[PDB]
Amino acid sequence: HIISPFNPRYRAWEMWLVLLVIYSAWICPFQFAFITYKKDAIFIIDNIVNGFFAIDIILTFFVAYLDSHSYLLVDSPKKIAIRYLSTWFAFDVCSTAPFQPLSLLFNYELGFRILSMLRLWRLRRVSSLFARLEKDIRFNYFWIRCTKLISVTLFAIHCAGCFNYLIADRYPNPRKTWIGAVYPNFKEASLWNRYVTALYWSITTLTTTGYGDFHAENPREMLFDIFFMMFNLGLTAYLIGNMTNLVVHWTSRTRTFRDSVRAASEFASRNQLPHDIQDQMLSHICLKFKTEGLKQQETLNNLPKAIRSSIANYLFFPIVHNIYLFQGVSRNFLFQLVSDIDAEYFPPKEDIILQNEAPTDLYILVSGAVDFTVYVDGHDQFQGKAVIGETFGEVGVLYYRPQPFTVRTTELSQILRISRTSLMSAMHAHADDGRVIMNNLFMKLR
Amino acid sequence: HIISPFNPRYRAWEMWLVLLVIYSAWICPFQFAFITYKKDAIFIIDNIVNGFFAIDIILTFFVAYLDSHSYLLVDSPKKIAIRYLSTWFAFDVCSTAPFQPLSLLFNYELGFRILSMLRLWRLRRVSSLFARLEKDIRFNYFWIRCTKLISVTLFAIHCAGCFNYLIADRYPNPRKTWIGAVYPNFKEASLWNRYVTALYWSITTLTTTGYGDFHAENPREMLFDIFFMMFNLGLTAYLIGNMTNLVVHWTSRTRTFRDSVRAASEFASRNQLPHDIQDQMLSHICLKFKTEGLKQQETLNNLPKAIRSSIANYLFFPIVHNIYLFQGVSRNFLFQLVSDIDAEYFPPKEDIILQNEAPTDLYILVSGAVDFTVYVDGHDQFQGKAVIGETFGEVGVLYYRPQPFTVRTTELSQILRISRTSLMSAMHAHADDGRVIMNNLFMKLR
Amino acid sequence: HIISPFNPRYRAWEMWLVLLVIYSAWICPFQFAFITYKKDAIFIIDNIVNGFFAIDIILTFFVAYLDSHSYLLVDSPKKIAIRYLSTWFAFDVCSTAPFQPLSLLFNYELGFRILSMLRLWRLRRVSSLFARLEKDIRFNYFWIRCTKLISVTLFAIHCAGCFNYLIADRYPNPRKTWIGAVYPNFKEASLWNRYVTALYWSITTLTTTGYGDFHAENPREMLFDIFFMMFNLGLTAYLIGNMTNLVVHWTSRTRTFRDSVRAASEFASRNQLPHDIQDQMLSHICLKFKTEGLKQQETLNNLPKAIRSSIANYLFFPIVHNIYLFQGVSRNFLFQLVSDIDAEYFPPKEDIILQNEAPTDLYILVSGAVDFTVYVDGHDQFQGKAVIGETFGEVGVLYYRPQPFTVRTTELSQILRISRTSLMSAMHAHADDGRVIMNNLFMKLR
Amino acid sequence: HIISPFNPRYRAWEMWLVLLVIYSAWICPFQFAFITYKKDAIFIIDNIVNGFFAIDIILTFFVAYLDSHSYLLVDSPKKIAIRYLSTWFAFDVCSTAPFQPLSLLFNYELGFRILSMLRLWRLRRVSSLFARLEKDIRFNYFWIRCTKLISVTLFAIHCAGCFNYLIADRYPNPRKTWIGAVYPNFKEASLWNRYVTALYWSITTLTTTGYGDFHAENPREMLFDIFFMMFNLGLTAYLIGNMTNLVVHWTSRTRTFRDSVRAASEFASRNQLPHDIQDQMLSHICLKFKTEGLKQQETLNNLPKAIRSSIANYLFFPIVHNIYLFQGVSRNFLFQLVSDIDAEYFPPKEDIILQNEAPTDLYILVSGAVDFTVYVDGHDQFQGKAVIGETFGEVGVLYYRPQPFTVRTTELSQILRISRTSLMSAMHAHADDGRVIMNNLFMKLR
Ligand SMILES: CCCCCCCCCCCCCC(=O)O[C@@H](COC(=O)CCCCCCCC)COP(=O)(O)O
Ligand SMILES: CCCCCCCCCCCCCC(=O)O[C@@H](COC(=O)CCCCCCCC)COP(=O)(O)O
Ligand SMILES: CCCCCCCCCCCCCC(=O)O[C@@H](COC(=O)CCCCCCCC)COP(=O)(O)O
Ligand SMILES: CCCCCCCCCCCCCC(=O)O[C@@H](COC(=O)CCCCCCCC)COP(=O)(O)O
Ligand SMILES: CC(C)CCC[C@@H](C)[C@H]1CC[C@H]2[C@@H]3CC[C@@H]4C[C@@H](O)CC[C@]4(C)[C@H]3CC[C@]12C
Ligand SMILES: CC(C)CCC[C@@H](C)[C@H]1CC[C@H]2[C@@H]3CC[C@@H]4C[C@@H](O)CC[C@]4(C)[C@H]3CC[C@]12C
Ligand SMILES: CC(C)CCC[C@@H](C)[C@H]1CC[C@H]2[C@@H]3CC[C@@H]4C[C@@H](O)CC[C@]4(C)[C@H]3CC[C@]12C
Ligand SMILES: CC(C)CCC[C@@H](C)[C@H]1CC[C@H]2[C@@H]3CC[C@@H]4C[C@@H](O)CC[C@]4(C)[C@H]3CC[C@]12C
C-alpha cells in the first residue's frame, strides 16, 4: 500500500518530472520578458505542467524514504508526513499554486509576473539529480560536475539577457538604452534578432570581454550592471576553482611517478653509482608503474582480510596446488595456507638471489625464465635453471643455510613469495608438515 | 575592580563599536569627495563618533587579556598598560584625535582632509572580528571568509570610485576628464547620478571588463589608473585563490570515495575476477562510505584513550551486559573489558565466516539477521542461525578449532568484534574467568 | 615476417608522419577559407600526403603491439586485425579517402570542403606522442605539457580566425561585417594583411582583452561569437589549472623546508629555550635539507631490500673492511653484515655522545674531525680524539656500560651507525665473533 | 691569497653590483626608445658601469665556492677557472664588452642598439639573490616571492611600453599609429606625457582590461600585439598560480582544525551522545589547537633522539628532581631517566582517572589544581587532592592494583606522564631502585 523508492515506476516518474522542470526553467524568463500573456497556446501547456506538479504534491505522501540512523527503510506513513511537511512542503505548494491563471480569470500585471517567478523553486530536482549522479558508481565523475557548471553558466546568461531586455523595453525614450542607441528601430524586429542581441550582450560581460558596444546609458540600467558584474566575478572564480580540481586530479599519477624517478636519479647522481645500480633502480620503478602496485597495496590493505583471502584463493590456489614440495597436503590446510601469499613482479636482468646470501624467502615462479650462474667461485658459464611452476629457495626451508647459486632473470617474470617467517608461522599447523618433510627428503636424495 | 574580557557588557560594547566602525568607514571617502564640510548636520554625528572612541581609549585600560605562555588570565593592572601602550596606543590616539573640528573652530582645507583619512585605523576591529569568528566553533567557516572577501572588494570599489570623482572635480577644463567628455554638464546633476556613475566606472575596471566608456584623458588621471589596475590584478588573483580553496575543500570526500572505487575496479578488471569478488569489494566500499568510518578511525585514534573508553562504555555496556556467556561477571571487570571493543558494520550477502576457517574473532550481533549454511560437506540447505544479541564464534574461545558452519548475511548488520588476542589479553584478569568457563561448560552440555 | 614496434625504421616512419600531420593540420583551415581550389600546385602536395597515409593504412597490419595482461609481445597476425579493425580503422579510412580530388575529376563545392575537414582525424598521432613523452623518462615533464597547451591554444587561434574570415567573405553587403565596417576595401588587399587581421581579431577575444574594434554586426556572426566565447572561457580555465599545477609542484620542497623551520621556531620560542638548543635544532634541519635525506629515506624504504643491499655493499664495504675491530672476519660474513648499515650526516659543534650516557650505537667515522672533552668531572681541557676510519663507541659492545667522554664535532662529518640491537642481532652469526672478541681483548689490553 | 665567499667585503661588493644591475635594467629600454645617444651626460655613467663589471670579471677568479659532493670549501685556484670559464664566462664577457662607445669613436645605429640590448644578461644576479633569500632563514618566504613576481610584472610593463613607442616613432604617416590617431601632435610633447601614455597603453593590455583607446592600425604593430598578448596570457596564469599557493598555504592550520571539529561533531551526532562526551571531545580538540601539539609531535619525532634528550633535560629535570618519591636517586641515573618523559596538557573538568580503573601511567602535576571525589561507592562529597609538584598514581608502581579515587580537574593543568611500561623499562637500571622502594615503604606507612 506504500510505494517503494526503488520501483521502476517511480524513477521514470522522477525523470519525466526532470524534463518538465528543465522546460519550465527555460520558458520562465523568456515568458517574463519577450512575449505577451493574453494569447493562450502556451497558457494551456503551463496549466498542464502545473497539473503534473499538483499530482506530485499528493503522490509524495505515498513514498518511503531512507533514514539516516537506521537504514534500508521507513514505512508506516506516520513520520513520512512529518518529514515532508516540515522540509519541502511550503515552497512546493507556493510554487505549484497558480496565480496568473486566477488573475486572468478573476478580474484582470507586473506584480503577478513576480508571483510566476516562484516557479524556479521547482529547480531543486535538478540539484537532487546532480547530487545522486556523483555518488552513483556507474557514471564518470569528471563529466557530471562539468555538466553541472555548464548548466549554471548557461542559465545565468539566459536569465540576465532576458532581464536586461525587459529593463530596456519598459523605459521611455528608446534612445539612451543599450539596444536603442545602436539600433534605433528595435521593437519592430523579430524575436530571433532581439533574443540573439540580448544573449550576445550578456555573454560579453559574463566572459569579461566587454567590446564596447551596448554599454549602459539609463541610470537604472547602469545600476543593474553593477550587480550583474559582481555576480560574474564570483561565478568566474568558482569556475576556475572547479577546473583546477579537474586538472590537479587528472594528472596526479604521472606526476607522482616522475617525482619518484627524479628522487632516484638525484640519489644516484649524488653518490656516483656507476651504471648498473642506476638501471636496476630506474627499471624497477618503471615496472612498479606499469603494473601500478602502490594502489594495489593500499586498497588490499584496506580490505577486511577475508575478502583478500578469497582473492588469493581464486588467484593462486591451482598454482600452489601442484608443486615439487606439496603433494598430498590436505586442501583444508591449503585454505589457511594460501591467504598469506604476497604476489610480486620483477624486471628482467635483475639479480634476484645472489651467491652466499643468507636466505629470506621462497620464490615460486608463475611465469618467466630464470638463469642461474656461479657467483665469485665461478668466473663464467656453469649451470642454474627453474621453469614455470618449478620453485626454488628450498634450501632455506629448515637448513638455514645460504643459497648456492646466483639468480638472474632473462625475460620478465611473476614470482610469488612465501617468506621465511611465514613458513615458520605455518609450522605450528602440524600433522601435515610430515608430508612436506618426506617430500623434502625424497626430493633431495634423488 | 577590573573588567573581565568575557562579560556580557564588554562584548556588546565591542559589537556596538563594530557597527560604528562600519559607519565611519563607509562615510569617510563619500565625505572626502562629494559633499562639502561647512554644514553641520553630519559634523554633529562625526563628533559624537569621535566621543565614543575617546571613551574606548580610556576604557581599554580596565580590561584584562589572555597571555600566551600562562593562560586564562592576566590581572593586576601593571603590564596591561605595557601591552596597550606599546602595541595599539599611538595610532589609536592619532585616529581618535579631531583635526577638522579644530581647523574649523581655530582659524579656517585639503591638507586637513588627509588628516581625516586617518580614521581608517579604526578598521582593525573588523579584522579582529574576522579573526575571532574563524576560530570560534559555532559558525560556518566557508561563510565567514567569503564575507570577508566581499567586504574588501566592495570597499575597494567604493574608495576608488570616490577618489576618481575627486580627481575629476578638481581639474580645470571639465572636458577631457572621464565623466566630462561623455556628460558635458555633470556638476549640476544630483548625488545619485554622479555616485552611480563613479561606481559603474570603478567596477568595470575592477572586474576587468572595460567597455570603452569613461577612459582617461587627463594625464594625472591616466597616472591614477596605472596604480588602480595594478591593485586590481593583485586582488583578482587573491580572490581566485580563495575560491580555489573553497572548491578543493568542499568536494574532497566524494573525490576520495571515487578514487577508491576506481582503484578497486582497476585491480579487479586487471586480474579478471568473475563477478562475486567485484560485488563484494564494491559494496563494502559503498558501505564504508555511507557510514564514514575512515574519519571515525582517525578521530578515535587521536583521542586520549580514556574518553574513547567512556564512549564505548556508553555505547556497548548494556549490550555486552546481557549475553549467553557473561552472566555474573562483576561489572568492575566490565569497565576494563568494554574499552577495547572495536565496533564494525557489514554489508548483506557477504560471507562473514566460512567453513573450516581457522578462528580469529568473536562476532556479537547487535542487529541484523544471519543465515548459516553447510560449506563443501553440504551442497545446499542445512541449518545455521543467530539473532539480535545472540553471539557466535564461541568455538574458538579456548578450543582453538575451526568454525563449523558458513556465515552469510541476509539483511545488513552491526557486528562487534572482540578478537582472539583481545580475549587472551583479557585472560590474566582472573577470579572471574571461572564464571565464563562454567557458562561455557553448562552452555555446550545442554 | 612481422615488424617489431621498437625497430629504428618504424619509429622514424612515425616521426615523419608526425611532421606530415602538423603540415596537414596547419594547411586545412587556411585552405578552407582564404585560397581557391582550382589551381593545382598545392593539390599535388595534398594528394601526395594522402598517398603517404594510404600507405600507412596498409602497413599498420604488419606491426606488433604490447598487450595489457600478458606483456612484451603479441605476434601471429590474428587479433592484430581484430585490434586495428575495431578501434581505429573506420575514421582513418574515412579521413584518408580523397573526396575533393573525386569531385574535381568526376563532374565539378561547400559540402565537399566539409568532407575535407575530416582530415583532422589524422591529429590523433600528436596526442599519441604527447602521451608517450610524458611517460618516457628522458624528457622534462614540465616542458612537454606546456608545449601541449601552447599547441592547442595556437591551433584554436588559427582555426577560429580563419572561420570568421570565411563567414565575413560569404555574406552580401561587405559593410556591416567585422572587417568590412573598418576597412571598406578589404578583398583587394593581400593575404598577409587579411591573415594578420583575422589573427589579431581572434586573439583579442581569446585572451579576453576585447578592445572594441572588429565587433560583430551580422547576426549570424553575432551568433558565432557566442560559441567562440564559451569555448574561450572553458580553455582559459583549463590553462590556469595547468599553470597552478606547475607552480604548486615546482616549489614544494622549499615550502616544506620553511614549514619545518617555522614549526621548530614556534616550539622553541614557546617554551623559552635559551640559545644553544635553538641553534642545534635549526642547524640540524638546515643540514637535513642540504643533503635531502627525507626523499632518501622514502625511496630507500620503497626499494625491494636486495638492491639496497647492493647499494650499501658498493658504498660502505671498503670502509668497514678496514677497522680497528674487524681484521679477518671472512667477507662472506661481511656481505650479510653490510646490508643493515644506516648512514647519517651530522652538523659541526653538535654534542654527539655526552658523558655517562647509556650507550645506543656504534659511531664509525667516515670523514670529519671529532673533539672529546671531559663532561661534569672535568671543567675544561682534558683529551679525546678519533680520525677518519677510527671508530668509537667500542665500550658498549658487550660491556653495557656508559660512555667515558663527551663527543663534540669540530668540522662536519659523516658517521655510520651500527646500533646496539643491530650488533646483538649480528651475534647469532657465530664462528667469526671469536675474532672480534680477540680483537677486543688484545685491543684494550695494549 | 684567495678571497673567501663569506667575507663582509665581498657581500657588500655583490649588493653594490645588485643596485648597479637594477639601474642598468631600468635604463636600457628607456634609452633604447625615447632619448637620443649623441649627448654624453648618461654615456659617462654607462661607461663607468661597464668599468665596474669589467672589474668584476677579473675579480671572480679570486673567489672560492662551495662544491656539491664535498662541502665547506674549494681552494687552490685550479678548477675555479674550470667552473667559471665553462658556466658563466662567455655571456658575461659578451655583455660587459662595449660596442656603442666603439661605434661612436670608430667611424659613426639600429644594429648597434641591439648589441646594447645584451646588457640584460647582467640580470642573473637578481635571480641569484632571489634564490638565496628564499633559502636563507631570516626572511619571510611569502614576502620575497611576491616581490619577485611584482618585479617581473613591472619590468614586462616597462619594456613592452617602450618597445611599442619605438615602433610608433619609426613608422611614416604618424596618423594610423596607436598614439598618432588619438594625439595628432605627439612628438612635440614632453617625456613625461609620452612615457605615461606608453605605460598606460601597456598596462591595459597586460591586466586584460582593454578599454578601446590606443588600438593598433599599423599592420606591423598589429603583429606586435599578437606576441605581447600571448605573453600576457602566460604571465597572468603564472601569477594566479603563485597567489593560489600563498592562499592555500596561509590558511592550512585553521582549515585542518575545523576539519577535526566537523568530524568529531558528525561522529557525536550520529551515535547520539548526550552532552558530556561532546563537550569533552570538543574542548579537548580546542586545547590541542591552542597549544599546537601536532606539529610538536611531528618535529620532535623528526629529531635525532639526543637533542630531544637535552630538551627534556632542560625542561623537566628540576621538576622531577624534587618529588615525594625521588630523594637521593643519583643524578647520573636522572639523565637516563628524564629523556623518555612525555609531557601533555589537559582541559578542565575532564575526568582524568576514574574509580577502579586498571592503572596505566604516573601523573606528576606541574601546575593546575586537581579535585578527587568518590566514584560509585560515594554519591557525593568525600575527599581527594594533589598540588603543584605533588604526584599521584603511586598505587600502580608495583602493586598493580586499580586507582582508589576519581580525578577531575578544576582549573587547567600540565601533567607529565611516565607510564607503566616506561617505569618497568626503568626497572633494570638497579642499585638505585632500592631508594625508590624505601621511599615507597616509608611513604605509605606514615
Ligand atoms: C538555456 C537554459 C538551460 C536551463 C537548464 C539549466 C538549469 C540547471 C540548474 C542547475 C542548478 C544546480 C546547481 C547547483 O547546485 O549550484 C552549484 C552552485 O553554483 C554556484 O557556483 C554559485 C556561485 C555563486 C557566486 C557567488 C555570488 C557572489 C556574490 C552547486 O555547486 P556544488 O558546490 O557542486 O554543490
Ligand atoms: C560599502 C562600504 C563597505 C564597508 C565595509 C567593509 C570594511 C571591511 C574591511 C575588512 C578588512 C579586513 C580584511 C583583511 O584583513 O584583509 C585580507 C587581506 O586582503 C587582501 O587580500 C589584500 C590583497 C592586496 C593585493 C596586493 C597588492 C598588490 C600590490 C586578509 O585576508 P587573510 O589572508 O584572510 O588574513
Ligand atoms: C599554427 C598551427 C599549429 C598546429 C599544431 C598544433 C596541433 C596540436 C594539437 C594537439 C592536440 C592534442 C592535445 C590534447 O590531447 O588535448 C588536451 C585537452 O585540451 C583541452 O584542454 C580542451 C578543453 C576544452 C574546453 C572545454 C569546452 C567548453 C565547452 C588534453 O589535455 P590532457 O588533460 O593533458 O590529456
Ligand atoms: C621599473 C624597472 C624595474 C626593474 C627591476 C626588475 C628586474 C627584476 C627581474 C627579476 C627576474 C628574475 C625572476 C625569475 O627568475 O623568473 C621567474 C619566472 O618568471 C616567469 O614567470 C616567466 C613566465 C613566462 C610566461 C610563459 C610565456 C608564454 C609563452 C622565476 O620564477 P620561479 O619559478 O620562482 O623560479
Ligand atoms: C542574475 C542572474 C544571473 C541570476 C541567476 C542566478 C541563478 C544562478 C540562480 C537563480 C535561481 C537559483 C536556484 C533556485 C533554488 C535552487 C534550490 C537549491 O536547493 C539549490 C540551488 C538552486 C538550484 C538555485 C541555484 C541558483 C539559481 C539557479
Ligand atoms: C585604491 C583603493 C582601492 C585602496 C583600498 C585599499 C583597502 C583594501 C585598504 C585601505 C585601508 C586598509 C586597512 C587599514 C588598516 C587595517 C589594519 C590591519 O590590521 C588589517 C588590515 C587593514 C584592515 C587594512 C586592510 C586594507 C585596507 C582596507
Ligand atoms: C572553434 C575552434 C576553436 C575549434 C578548435 C578546437 C580544437 C581545440 C579541436 C579541433 C579538432 C580536435 C582534435 C581532433 C580529434 C583528436 C583525437 C583525440 O584522440 C584527441 C583529441 C583531438 C586531438 C582533438 C583535440 C581538439 C581539437 C584539436
Ligand atoms: C615582451 C617583453 C614583455 C619581454 C619581457 C620579458 C622579460 C620578462 C625577460 C627579458 C629578459 C629576461 C631575463 C634575462 C635572462 C635572465 C637569466 C636567467 O638565469 C634567469 C631569467 C632571466 C632573469 C630572464 C628573466 C626574464 C626576462 C627578464
XYZ file of C-alpha atoms in Angstrom, chain B residues 23-47 49-50 99-101 104 109-110 112-120 122 155 158-159 161-163 165-166 169-170 191 195:
55
model
C 29.579 53.582 9.626
C 32.795 55.616 9.742
C 34.497 53.587 7.024
C 31.531 53.949 4.714
C 31.210 57.705 5.227
C 34.873 58.766 5.016
C 35.524 58.587 1.219
C 31.988 59.753 0.463
C 32.612 62.737 2.715
C 36.089 63.197 1.269
C 34.886 63.647 -2.310
C 31.241 64.537 -2.877
C 29.816 66.680 -0.102
C 31.087 69.917 1.406
C 32.012 70.435 5.059
C 30.671 73.812 6.255
C 27.197 72.461 7.025
C 26.967 70.721 10.361
C 24.223 68.044 10.347
C 26.784 65.270 9.780
C 29.532 67.150 11.677
C 27.472 66.507 14.818
C 27.404 62.755 14.174
C 31.128 62.632 13.433
C 31.948 64.428 16.675
C 31.532 59.046 16.992
C 34.864 60.578 17.994
C 41.680 67.794 13.480
C 38.983 69.089 11.144
C 36.727 70.307 14.042
C 37.036 74.788 11.636
C 41.398 72.562 3.675
C 42.797 69.740 1.560
C 43.159 68.752 6.736
C 41.084 66.154 4.896
C 44.120 63.879 4.647
C 44.315 64.109 8.432
C 40.711 62.922 8.433
C 41.648 59.948 6.262
C 43.441 58.556 9.332
C 40.011 57.478 10.615
C 40.646 54.221 8.725
C 39.653 52.274 13.383
C 35.273 48.771 -0.078
C 33.754 52.427 -3.146
C 37.014 54.168 -2.266
C 35.214 55.425 -7.308
C 35.089 58.336 -4.902
C 38.780 59.168 -5.352
C 35.404 61.529 -8.857
C 37.544 63.824 -6.690
C 36.229 67.614 -9.900
C 39.487 69.335 -9.029
C 24.263 62.875 -5.972
C 27.636 58.360 -7.437
